[model samples]
Target: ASRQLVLVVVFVALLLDNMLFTVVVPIVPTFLYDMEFQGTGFLEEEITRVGVLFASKAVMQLLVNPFVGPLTNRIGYHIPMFAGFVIMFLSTVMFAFSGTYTLLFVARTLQGIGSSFSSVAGLGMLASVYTDDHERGRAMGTALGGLALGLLVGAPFGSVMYEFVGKSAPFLILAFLALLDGALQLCILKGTPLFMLLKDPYILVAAGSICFANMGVAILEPTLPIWMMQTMCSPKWQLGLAFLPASVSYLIGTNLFGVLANKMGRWLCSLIGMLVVGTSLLCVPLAHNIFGLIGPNAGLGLAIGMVDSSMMPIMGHLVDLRHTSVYGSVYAIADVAFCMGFAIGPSTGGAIVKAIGFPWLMVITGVINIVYAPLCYYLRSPP
Candidate 1:
């Protein structure tokens, strides 16, 4: 009953976090583009402005993530969890009220900080509560399903929200959700703080997988969307269409792949998934239109699903129960890696896209995914 309760709460929290996030992305670029131009016409400033807005969030994540494991280990997870919620609440409020681009960037960066802290702590919590190895795969998959379901539903709904309610509406909604999420976490996971599970080989592997997956997501969601705006003939709303099938891919891969990991082995399922991700990224630049984009996007999602569905279970298996009195730090590692990838991915992709165009971006990202798969071998079963 405790495990069931833990899993359900974790699922809900993850879903809400993702929902808040997806609501922001589909609209931010356009908002930045509008503010920068203001009838003066698109300046070189537009590129820098949007880039910074995008990169700022990632930068905070990159900077803050490394400390997550240590702090979570020492202070316990809930303190950071509550702190992150407050910070995000402030950021969203700032965004809602601010008129200047500078203020917006500051707000975005703060929210990113909150994201880094909350997510890292949340994942760690997920790790702590899940104890059974045999059931871990399905459990992890279900968590991921919550995440994907958030993404699938969030992206389109976010777009519609932007279209209908104005930019401030989304931020307002996010602010409320942040408060509610923190409250729910307080109510559900309240107990003696669990011990941190740092210093294990399994944490390393799980962290690596998160880094790779995060890298892919960073590239696909932010960079790819801009590319679509630049290259494709479709309208902005149509761009949301690209992610539709991706959600399906995510559901299928994670739901089924989790079962496969249980039956076949964690290593095999993880490696294959990474390989697929890499290959799919390579195909993105070649996409002639929305349909073409779907293939690669779906591929990326499925690959992520495969990797994600198993990585957490493997993490649980790796650490001794004594080593992980609290699961908060374990999840923190993944979040930090995610933050790092988010910070680095777009800048790298931007340079490549400018130097060689969209095709190059996809190829390079794909190659990274393909290459990273072999590293899965480093992730051994827990002794």
Candidate 2:
């Protein structure tokens, strides 16, 4: 009972943290254009700037990730986690009131730092709390379920709140949520020490998969709404709704595939996910209308959910294989991979789209995913 309560609190914290990460998605491009900074350049330039903004956060997270593992190992989880929430809270407040791109950039960078602290510490706490494979898998699955739910709400809610409530509303809500989680962490979360786990080939491959998966998602994130707005003449709210199918299906996919991973084994689930996601990316540009996108987008979410849910359990198992106190370090390495992908995807995709076009960009992304599948299969064999 106590564990369950603790997990619930952890889940809420994670959910809100993810929401904070995603809430800017529906707003950034438009907000950039609206701000109309005299020096911001053309529409495409503004859009690219938005991608850079997203990438900046990931870059900061990447820089901080290696240290997060060691820091959590030395200090314990609660303090770092609380510290993360405090930074996030301040970032939210800064974002709410920012009038210039510079301020927004700073706010996002702060958010990245916060994400580094909270996610590494929180994941380390999860690894420590659930030692058994079955328990750990279920716990990780449940935690991802919260993340899926957060993305589900966060993506759409960003537009909804910005359009109806106010520009500041979403950030205000997020700020308070962060504040609450910080308090919650003080009471419930715990931490452990550093060990060498990232050296394993299997763990390295697993982290690579996370990086590739996120790369595919991040490629489209900054550009999608802008593309839709320009091509299909969609509204801001419709932009949010466009992401709905994927987010909703992601929740379903995570829970369903989480169980399947335990039964069918991680490698198989990942292969299936990789295949589905690649196919979905290939088809993404075929959507002439927003409605045409719903099916493909949902498929993308389902695939991501399958791969993501399976990977964590596999990571947990790998940590057990090492038999050490370095869960913090292990998760931090994985996070670095994930953040690196995000860091690369947006800026690169934006530049590519500018040169060739969105359709070709999607083609490139699809090929990347398709090529990645066999690599996963190959790596599954032990070194």
Candidate 3:
């Protein structure tokens, strides 16, 4: 019952966090694009503006990440978790009401702070509650499923609902969900406060796998929809649907691959998954239409899901072997990895898209994924 109840609470917390996180994917680029130009002249600035908006959340997330570690460890998880909810509610309401760029940017950054608490702390909570090794692995695995499920819902929810209901409507509603989720935690209960773990190189390796997984998708997050606007000429809702194939496929891969990683070897799964991730990214710029984009996008999601499934469990195994009472800091490492991917992916991505263009950027990022082959190969059983 502890496992079940805890998992659901973590799941819903992250679900709401990610839901608010991604709800902007389809809408924001268009939202700002219309605000600035509305026509079609400055592609570079459009991409840059959108890229910064997306990057700002992770920027603050990373900034807040270190402190969250020591604080959660000291204060315990639930208080910070509740505080995070309060912060998230403000951010969501800001997104709903604010029409200006500065307000939007600040709102997005605050979310990064909130997520720093829920995500790093949520995994830490799972780690503390599940005393058994294998049990901890699956609960953590199931927890990330919450992340993907929110992405699945948020994109469509924002695009479809905003299309019909209007601009502020979707966010206003999501803000309410944030309020409700935060309050629900008052009833249930809630880790990773900020710190570092460096005795194990494999933890870094585990961090790499999840980092690159987030990196692979995040590169697409800002630029892809804008690319579609130029080439595919799809509407906002269609732009939102573009994300569906990836999230749905990822939702599948996250669980199934967790099972395979158990039997096959975590490094082996990482090796296989990275190869797929590289290939999928390389194929993205090749797509000519929405149908064509779906194939590669689906590949990115599935491969990333596979990679994360292994890396998370492997991190826990390493921690169990080497240390204790620091699960929050350990997952804080993963959160740093994740936010770096998000921060770097979009931060540089827009400029690269401006200079060499979208196609080359995807190719380069893909090659970086494949290059992980050597590192993952050596992960070699949590040594």
Candidate lDDT (C-alpha), each: 0.69, 0.77, 0.78
Query: Compared with the true structure, what per-residue lDDT tens digits does model 2 show for residues 227-334?
Result: 887778766677887888888888789878877677777888887888888899999988888899998899998998888888876776666655553434455556
Residues 76-103, model 3: lDDT tens digits: 8778777777788889888888888789
Deviation (Å) of 170 in candidate 1: 2.1
What's each prediction's clash count? Answer: 9, 0, 8
Candidate 3 residue pairs in clash (backbone atoms < 3 Å): 68-193, 68-194, 69-193, 69-194, 70-194, 121-191, 121-192, 192-328
- Deviation (Å) of 178 in candidate 3: 2.0
Sorted on lDDT, highest at the top, how do the candidates line up? Answer: 3, 2, 1
- Candidate 2: give its CA RMSD in angstroms: 3.9
Residues 1-383, candidate 1: write the lDDT tens digits.
35676576567666766776676666766666556551333333344345446678878777776777689989887787777778878987887788777887887788778777776776666666666765776776688568777787877766676666777887787678767766666665432222234445556667777678757777666655566666665665665566777778888988788777888888888888888888887776787777887787888888888888878777656654435333333454555577667777766666665556566667777787777778888775544
CA lDDT for candidate 2? 0.77
Each candidate: RMSD:
5.2, 3.9, 3.3
Q: In model 2, which residue pairs have backbone atoms overlapping below 3 Å?
A: none
Of candidate 1, the 10-residue stretch with the lowest lDDT total is: 38-47
Lowest summed-lDDT stretch of 10 residues in model 3?
Answer: 189-198
What lDDT would candidate 1 get against the real structure?
A: 0.69
